[PDB]
Curated annotation (Swiss-Prot), chain A:
Keywords for this protein: Cytoplasm, Isopeptide bond, Nucleus, Proteasome, Ubl conjugation
Protein name in UniProt: Proteasome subunit alpha type-3
Job description of the protein: The proteasome degrades poly-ubiquitinated proteins in the cytoplasm and in the nucleus. It is essential for the regulated turnover of proteins and for the removal of misfolded proteins. The proteasome is a multicatalytic proteinase complex that is characterized by its ability to cleave peptides with Arg, Phe, Tyr, Leu, and Glu adjacent to the leaving group at neutral or slightly basic pH. It has an ATP-dependent proteolytic activity.
Name of the encoding gene: PRE9
PANTHER family: PROTEASOME SUBUNIT ALPHA/BETA
Swiss-Prot record, chain D:
UniProt gene name: PRE6
GO biological process: proteasomal ubiquitin-independent protein catabolic process; proteasome-mediated ubiquitin-dependent protein catabolic process
Residue list for modification Phosphothreonine: 58
Task of the protein: The proteasome degrades poly-ubiquitinated proteins in the cytoplasm and in the nucleus. It is essential for the regulated turnover of proteins and for the removal of misfolded proteins. The proteasome is a multicatalytic proteinase complex that is characterized by its ability to cleave peptides with Arg, Phe, Tyr, Leu, and Glu adjacent to the leaving group at neutral or slightly basic pH. It has an ATP-dependent proteolytic activity.
UniProt entry keywords in alphabetical sequence: Cytoplasm, Nucleus, Phosphoprotein, Proteasome
Additional free-text comment from the UniProt record: Present with 16800 molecules/cell in log phase SD medium.
Descriptive protein name: Proteasome subunit alpha type-4
UniProt-annotated location(s): Cytoplasm; Nucleus
Gene3D superfamilies listed in its UniProt record: Glutamine Phosphoribosylpyrophosphate, subunit 1, domain 1
Superkingdom to which the source organism belongs: Eukaryota
Species annotation: Saccharomyces cerevisiae (strain ATCC 204508 / S288c)
Lineage of the organism: Eukaryota, Fungi, Dikarya, Ascomycota, Saccharomycotina
From Swiss-Prot, chain E:
Compartment annotation: Cytoplasm; Nucleus
Pfam families given in the database record: Proteasome (PF00227), Proteasome_A_N (PF10584)
Organism placement in taxonomy: Eukaryota, Fungi, Dikarya, Ascomycota, Saccharomycotina
Main location (coarse class): cytoplasm
Protein name per UniProt: Proteasome subunit alpha type-2
Gene3D superfamilies (UniProt xref): Glutamine Phosphoribosylpyrophosphate, subunit 1, domain 1
Complexes and interactors: The 26S proteasome consists of a 20S proteasome core and two 19S regulatory subunits. The 20S proteasome core is composed of 28 subunits that are arranged in four stacked rings, resulting in a barrel-shaped structure. The two end rings are each formed by seven alpha subunits, and the two central rings are each formed by seven beta subunits. The catalytic chamber with the active sites is on the inside of the barrel.
Keywords, alphabetical: Cytoplasm, Isopeptide bond, Nucleus, Proteasome, Ubl conjugation
Cross-link (Glycyl lysine isopeptide (Lys-Gly) (interchain with G-Cter in ubiquitin)), chain numbering: 108
UniProtKB/Swiss-Prot annotation, chain F:
E.C. no: 3.4.25.1
GO BP annotations, alphabetical order: proteasomal ubiquitin-independent protein catabolic process; proteasome-mediated ubiquitin-dependent protein catabolic process
Organism whose genome encodes this protein: Saccharomyces cerevisiae (strain ATCC 204508 / S288c)
GO cellular component: cytosol; nucleus; proteasome complex; proteasome core complex, beta-subunit complex; proteasome storage granule
Function: The proteasome degrades poly-ubiquitinated proteins in the cytoplasm and in the nucleus. It is essential for the regulated turnover of proteins and for the removal of misfolded proteins. The proteasome is a multicatalytic proteinase complex that is characterized by its ability to cleave peptides with Arg, Phe, Tyr, Leu, and Glu adjacent to the leaving group at neutral or slightly basic pH. It has an ATP-dependent proteolytic activity.
Name the record gives this protein: Proteasome subunit beta type-2
Other comment: The side chain of Thr-1 acts as a nucleophile, and the N-terminal amino group acts as a proton acceptor. Present with 11400 molecules/cell in log phase SD medium.
CDD domains: proteasome_beta_type_7 (cd03763)
Family note: Belongs to the peptidase T1B family.
Matches recorded under Gene3D superfamilies: Glutamine Phosphoribosylpyrophosphate, subunit 1, domain 1
Amino acid sequence: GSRRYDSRTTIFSPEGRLYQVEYALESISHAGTAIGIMASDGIVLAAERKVTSTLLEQDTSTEKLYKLNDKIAVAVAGLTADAEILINTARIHAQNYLKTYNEDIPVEILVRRLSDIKQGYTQHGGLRPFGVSFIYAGYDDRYGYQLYTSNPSGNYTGWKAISVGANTSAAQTLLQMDYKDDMKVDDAIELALKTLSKTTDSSALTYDRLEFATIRKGANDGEVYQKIFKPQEIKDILVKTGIT
Amino acid sequence: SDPSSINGGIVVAMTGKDCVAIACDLRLGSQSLGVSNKFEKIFHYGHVFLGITGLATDVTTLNEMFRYKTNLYKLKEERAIEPETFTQLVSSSLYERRFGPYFVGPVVAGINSKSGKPFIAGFDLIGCIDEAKDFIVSGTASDQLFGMCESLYEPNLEPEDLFETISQALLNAADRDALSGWGAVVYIIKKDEVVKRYLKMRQD
Amino acid sequence: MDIILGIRVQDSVILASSKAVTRGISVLKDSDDKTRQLSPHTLMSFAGEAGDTVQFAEYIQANIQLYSIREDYELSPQAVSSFVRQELAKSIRSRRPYQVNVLIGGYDKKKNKPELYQIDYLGTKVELPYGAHGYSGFYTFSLLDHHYRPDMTTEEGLDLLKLCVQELEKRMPMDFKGVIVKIVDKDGIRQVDDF
Amino acid sequence: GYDRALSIFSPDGHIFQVEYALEAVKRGTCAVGVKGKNCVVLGCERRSTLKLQDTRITPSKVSKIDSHVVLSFSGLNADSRILIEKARVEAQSHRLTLEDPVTVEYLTRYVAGVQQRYTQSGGVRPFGVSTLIAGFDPRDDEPKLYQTEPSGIYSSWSAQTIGRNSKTVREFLEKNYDRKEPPATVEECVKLTVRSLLEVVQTGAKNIEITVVKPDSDIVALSSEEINQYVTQIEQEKQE
Amino acid sequence: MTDRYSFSLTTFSPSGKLGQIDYALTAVKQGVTSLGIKATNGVVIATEKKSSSPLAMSETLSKVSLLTPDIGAVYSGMGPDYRVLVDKSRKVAHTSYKRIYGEYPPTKLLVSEVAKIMQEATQSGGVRPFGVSLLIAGHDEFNGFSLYQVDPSGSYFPWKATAIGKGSVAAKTFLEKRWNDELELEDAIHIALLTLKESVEGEFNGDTIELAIIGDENPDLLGYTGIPTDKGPRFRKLTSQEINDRLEAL
Amino acid sequence: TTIVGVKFNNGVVIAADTRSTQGPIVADKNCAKLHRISPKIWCAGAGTAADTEAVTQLIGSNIELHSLYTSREPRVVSALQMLKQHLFKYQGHIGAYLIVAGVDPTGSHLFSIHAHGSTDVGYYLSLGSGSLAAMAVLESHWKQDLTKEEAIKLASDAIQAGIWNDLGSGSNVDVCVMEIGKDAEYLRNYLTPNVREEKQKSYKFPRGTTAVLKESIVNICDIQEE
């Protein structure tokens, strides 16, 4: 109630709902929008950039998008500072598993382990929760293309499409409204660009404000090919979709 | 028998014009018992190729090891593995077991992607970084192979010429080795693409 | 004892594993089969030194089971055999090695493929048409090279096996006291009617 | 107050963090266990009202600890992930060292031991999950039902409910079940668990999840159409 | 004043933005105006130095320290945090790249390793953020001339142009007007002097102004001539006299 | 292995042969043995080859660290000290035995360092297995206050006595002259006895002598996104 107690993870709020976790939501939402749409013929990851300065080189930074391995890519939203520990561990853990069984990591595994460190910091150690949400885009042959989200609390839920960070509600109202159930991969790109232009300050959705990647099962002979699009290929496709 | 020569195997590499070759035989034996006619040991990380001779379990170990380390390289630095950096990387690991060294003979072959510069380098048990660009040999029957490679090889070989030369070098040593004889594979590695040729040769 | 055999046929993986347990110069037991069921589709037989045999076999069993349950997904046989190779590649560099030769048969349910991996003591894993371990294996490698054809049915796989068995008993002064032969196939693991 | 300490024993005799755990159990899904003579029926809510959710890869609330040991839970999903993992490892540990398959009763204790340990060790929160661990003892075909609490202790009841609107469910369990006689038939037993869950779900095919666990490693989760069949039959009675 | 949560670095702040991290920025501002301009064929970094006591020697106060012979750094902030951070940068780099890959880091990799150190003085409770924000300007072969900022948080960003300190506002706008990357390096040095000259006009003498370039190799300063293939030092620090020459070109 | 060190008035000159052997087989026709601790501190290595490279790399860094830390070129003796302790610990299993040479602001030096941990100073030193041969020239001709010019002849001639008597000594002689106040003048391939000669007869094979059983083309190249 009055005396808000939250110094440590171990110390409970009267409410029972740890305030440090509450503050984590605020932070996630501070960062701009990122969006994952899972399609039957690829996954599409499309986001508006955090940065906005033209002096600062927006172009070479794919702050949102880092690949952890050949099949798995993650979109990142929250605290940059904290985040940097977790992205790095995740890559090494993936390569540790490939060492052991000499197979790509299952998507489900890789999330559940990372979520469990996030819990670890509330379960024991005064150490703050590392308040970060990733959208995981991965492929395994257990379930095909898989998409996950992770809560700062340290739990995960699968999704057909999800939005993270800022203005989650608005992007969410649009996606569900015009949702096409099957989802074609071409379609997902179009649909994504429409949602971002409405939530993005520039309504012409400049290329220099855009990060884009497409992971495709629609890549020759039925295989998974990750392709990071540069700012120059974003620009060419911007004129294809016609917002500019 | 020291653990390396239980499993022997051979690797022979040569540079040619705008290309490298890395080639090996396919016989896997443990002592008197030959175990598999067909068995590979040349792997590639990007455009950089590494064959590895010696004790078989340690081959498998190191291959994993390097695959792990090289993954991080291409991800963090945001550029392909080069041969030059890669030569140092193989060397660093090998030295950490000074006492009781890995019982292996690694061989790097690949082309620097920044100037087409053909690059080969070799290694022994203990991490020696051999800079011969003419040829590199490794295995038990290394000695045999050197003797072929030194007469047959000539500076400047056309790609299609280099393919014949290395093949005769590998083949005749094979039949004067015990722990080799069964089949062969040649990687001819060019900047544009890789052609991989399974040869027909005599088999015991 | 010194013999473990495996033969990978058309539509199944067949394992035969010694019944003898000889601890010195006396046969303490003539029946116990030296195998541990890792999955209903994966069988591991084992041989080597006293003490190391039982600890290792059961330690491996536990790990595969734990894996199996955690995700509710039966790991590929390909993965299982890699698992074992690593644990051994560690052992041999460690304070105390584990000297156990194993044949890992699994029938990949999904790719409807039999797969037999020969992992000798070192931690040299190879996938072969057919394999064995120990000195015993030499004798039999000829009958398998000649008479094997891919088109051998499961049933024809049994027949060749009996002929190998007979030769092994003749020229080894030590009889391994017959074999319990079990079939790892899409049905699962079953024990041959006779043996 | 004393919510900032665990070491401090408190003259209230009640450390607030412990009280707060209970608030957390309440919030979670309702999870119910009702046992026959030959079965444990576990009826539980799994929410699925979430828009754009691919249901296939979303974890079912029930998690196989062992081959014949199951767990349902009420309370925070994140905190609950630690119990499931410790308990799985220990499962396989048991077989590795005793050979004996998992004694359920050991396992009940092992789990509670962890929620206890952390009450004594400062700088480690007590978990705000209560669980149901249910199973069948080695060499036995009598159903076994346990609940654990975040007070770091355990108890056995003939049937028990935990999570949101448990008050409502408890009246049902008193009047339709009895300790003296559990419903002898499996069938009887399943139909009552569906009626209990309906009181708080208020109509849902996938919002209701039924897993029946029988002896000798028999785990099967009831078919959506069969669940639907329990509902319609019950719903005819409601207007009579 | 602020919360006991925000002073703590083991405790999520209400806002989620530490008070701490914000203190580190207040201090950066309080320091010198340091800048970096990226050119086709070079990078120029330039700064003014503290006048300090009259009889304190100015030379010994060094605000540009070479990390490697081919990559220099510039900072705004306090001396003590600067030196300790600087020994850590070189040391961690030797281990992770001069023995492994037996060569000097890419600029990107070195920048990555500097962020990590930073990050740890913010993660661990009771250890304040580095009191300093860097520019790491450098040259490596693979990715050419490169220009960076590394924040005491442990986030880093490449730029076309950035400036830090009190006069950051002023400077950045001036660079924009007068220059773009495609312009040559020679022009930028004259420009950078003028920019820094707004900052202070009492003295602009080459004694109090430390100006350096990372550009072309100097095969003279390789120091073991007779082998040409090894890159010379990319960095060359320009003497006071040299500054004065560059002042009459303005 | 023949390595020499000769002080001269205004510096020091270090030389060693390029030929490398692994056993009785010649591994490398040329590969210099002269390694760089720093620009004006060079050493040439004998012993176990692997150890000599490794120790130079590890120590190298600390010396580089020193240099920058102190904003001053380390002493020749500083390298000497740091090198000595390392070897001493393992009681010489790490088997690098080195001639440490250099010039610094203090002056010119020439020392030897052994794996056991013993040191000496010499006006003129020799190391390797060809130490015996090289020295003999040195001791018969050397006078006090040789010129730079004269040091360089005496030196090279001495390596020749190694070459001809020690099998492992051979090919090009490489020289690094470090002089006070100047960038070391690495005289690459100062001396050349003879080199590889082309075989009398050609060993060019008409195509189709190799037989090709099967072929599978590998694409390390980027599969289309399309």
